[PDB]
Design a protein around this ligand. Sequence first.
Ligand code: FES
Lengths: 341, 93, 128, 150
Amino acid sequence: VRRCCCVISGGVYENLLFFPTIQLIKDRYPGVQVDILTTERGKQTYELNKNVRWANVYDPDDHWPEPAEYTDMIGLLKGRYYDMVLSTKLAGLGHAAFLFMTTARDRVSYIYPNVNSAGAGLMLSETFTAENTNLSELGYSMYTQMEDWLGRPFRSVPRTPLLPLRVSISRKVKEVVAAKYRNAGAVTGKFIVIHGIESDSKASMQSKGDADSLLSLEKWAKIIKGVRGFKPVFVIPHEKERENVEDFVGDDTSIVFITTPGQLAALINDSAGVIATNTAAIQLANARDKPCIGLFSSEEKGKLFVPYAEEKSNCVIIASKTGKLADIDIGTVKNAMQVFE
Amino acid sequence: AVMVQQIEGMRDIITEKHVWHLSDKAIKNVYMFYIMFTCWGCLYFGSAKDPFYDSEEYRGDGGDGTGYWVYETVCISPFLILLGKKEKNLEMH
Amino acid sequence: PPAVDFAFVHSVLLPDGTPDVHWRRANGGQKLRDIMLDSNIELYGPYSKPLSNCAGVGTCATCMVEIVNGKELLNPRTDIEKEKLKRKPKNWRLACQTNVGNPDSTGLVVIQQLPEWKAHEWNIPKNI
Amino acid sequence: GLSQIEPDINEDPIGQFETNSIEMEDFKYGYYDGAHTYYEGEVQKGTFWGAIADDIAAVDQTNGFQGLISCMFLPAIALGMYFDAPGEYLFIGAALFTVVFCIIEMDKPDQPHNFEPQIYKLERGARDKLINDYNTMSIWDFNDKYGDVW
Ligand code: FES
């Protein structure tokens, strides 16, 4: 192939965990101008790839788009003259016709388990029947079928990971996030991000399969009071939480407003510690070898969204014994003191 | 021109009724003068210091004069920073 | 008897420069407007004239009173107090929409009347 | 505008219909709307001719001759009627004025805002189309960054 589309979906998290797949594609073939037809909140993540070209905004999980927009994007994918598609939109017929209408040599897609994929094989080169209908619920991998097809053994080794999730930040986002946390009470070396706050916003980068992923503030106040301050900078998804956070943990605590995942990764790269709950902050921390702890609502979701915790030797994964994200708030403090210094 | 009209209700009316018209030739002449004014302005104000489409605000960022230069620019400068990022990763970040 | 202890700090300071506390006794919780009117303390201010206020329903933002030490026995903001005032320090409630509880009630709510036209800020200790 | 980073999506799409203005709670009347600004005392002179000719001089690329003919053109057509009725002379003279203006508008200055957007890199003063007839500089291919510094 020479040009490769990607019709992925989900938002911030699911677009982030596709970076191993795109690096796999660019490792399989020498030169691939990769394009992404994703949803808004997903294009922003594609500042952090250094392997992509266009990254347009479509929201393929709309199912009922404007025919002007639908035909515009169909003709766009046609006029870019792709050779592979690799949807992972998780739909069969209807969307299979949307991939077929694109002049593509190798239409690759995911498929509903239900009857909704009645005729997807008539248009696709690969089937990839899936699980749970909510693929992000599958966890961090989410693409093992797409990966174990991409670069199957035909001449050489697959090499499906390349040191998973090598995100990369630019210097301008680094400078503006540095000015952000310096306008806060933080120094570039000794500070710690948070990125877990009770909110109602899509900028917290949670998931499509996790509901009780974001932790409360009074429980977060007890967590952060249990630990001596290494200047924890708070990462709110919206300014309305700022006056809430100052009302809960105190006026002295410094809050940084980050909604762009590129700005978030620029914050991670300068941070020396991460106390994230199940958001994209955990994976951006595991990228660039930063020390996380990674709270979770269950050991199942913790193993699913962090299977490689035994490979970085810093992300001491934490969960809750019961559900509903009611964790201990005691031993997490102990191994936080262990790992952050 | 002057007419007295009787009406039962209110009063008498002293209508005047100056029926006139600009005329066929004068209408052509005002078309002529306005087209000549359009010529004069199209040339002169065309030769004026258009302050917006001269500076580094329009002509700097893109500034071709299209309406897609904004969108293709903010679709290209992501690609340019991504290419520079790949060049940075080519030489060990 | 079950007596709720109001204070009703006036907005105008005395010529001494110290606030004046009046300590109205009125029993039970029905409505803070009806309590401040039955017990005869200045609630409205210049809106105390007859038709200069809505007289209890909540359509005007006139009987607003800053209440501190009052997280104990109140009704929550009834979405008229949350809407008819929108950008306030959140200690300010409308007396005729709020309610200090039920007859069997004791407490020490201190309610600075006329928060508009005041000189002091009250420096409430930060919550949580 | 530029937006080197990707901008932040607004979580509050304010409304399909109501405007994007601030509410009256935060509106400082008088100063914003100009209803209580303009205290006379900071104003300046230039009574209607020291500020018209100033504005004409502010926006003008007309030289001595081109410009004089521009000032005398519309008075010539205005006196094409109410003084005489030449006819085709007016249109022939107007075409002559247009053509001589366009020949004059092949200006000796080239004013690099005239050129393509791809030209704006740096150092574009060393580029001199102003004097160099038959430039012969293959930089308008616009597919590779040639070093035109010579
Ligand atoms: S009197 Fe109108 S709000 Fe209470």
